[PDB]
């Protein structure tokens, strides 16, 4: 009964940042990596990167390196992804997912809309 509960929809101006949350329950939180994926209108699902909640170590897919930061707050079993320098290309549904290794359980998604 692992469950991931994400924060609600956000509306942001171009060049703003957004920080989306993912609260985990039903497993040892520091035990699994957390992944993020998004899907923007018309485009393919794309992998964003991962955070190890034990150490806070991260790595991002090349496309997002330098613009995306993942953090965690262990006291509340929550992982955050902050996306900076928002543009229309970033309007998308953002998903978190966890597993022993892969993406076994998914959050419900968070819509971010980048609007002029």
């Amino acid at each position: 009964q692992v469950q991931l509960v994400q924060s609600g929809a956000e509306v942001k101006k171009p060049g703003a940042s957004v920080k989306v949350s993912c609260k985990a329950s039903g497993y040892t939180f520091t035990g699994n990596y957390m992944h993020w994926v998004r899907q923007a209108p018309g485009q393919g699902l794309e992998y964003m990167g991962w955070i190890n909640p034990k150490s806070g170590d991260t790595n991002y897919a090349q496309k997002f390196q330098g613009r995306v930061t993942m953090t965690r707050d262990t006291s509340i079993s929550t992982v955050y992804m902050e996306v900076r320098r928002l543009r229309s290309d970033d309007t998308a549904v953002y998903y978190c997912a966890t597993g022993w290794w892969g993406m076994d359980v998914w959050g419900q998604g968070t819509l971010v809309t980048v609007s002029s």
């Binding site: 209108p41 393919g44 991962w50 549904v93 997912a97 998604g109």
Partner: protein, 110 residues
Amino acid sequence: DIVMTQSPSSLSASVGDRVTITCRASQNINNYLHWYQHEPGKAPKLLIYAASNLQGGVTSRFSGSGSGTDFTLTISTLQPEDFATYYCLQTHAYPLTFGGGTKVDIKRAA
């Protein structure tokens, strides 16, 4: 990084057709390849894990085959509820990588 090339990127078919979708890996990934169905507005749904294993609760009309660098997802007889975009996902190594997707459009025979 491992690049997953998925084909077709889009196709139109009709109910009762066989659909065949491929993913080619840029290097050998053994059997560490999964197939997802995506309906925009829902999280991706796992169909096939480790190349050929049908997920509990998923219709046996879906089947996966292949190993190494060449993988196929077959839908035996297309149904209206298959309207979705399908993806392969390699889990051989991080960063994880999706194929570019196959948008399956359903056209009337009628």
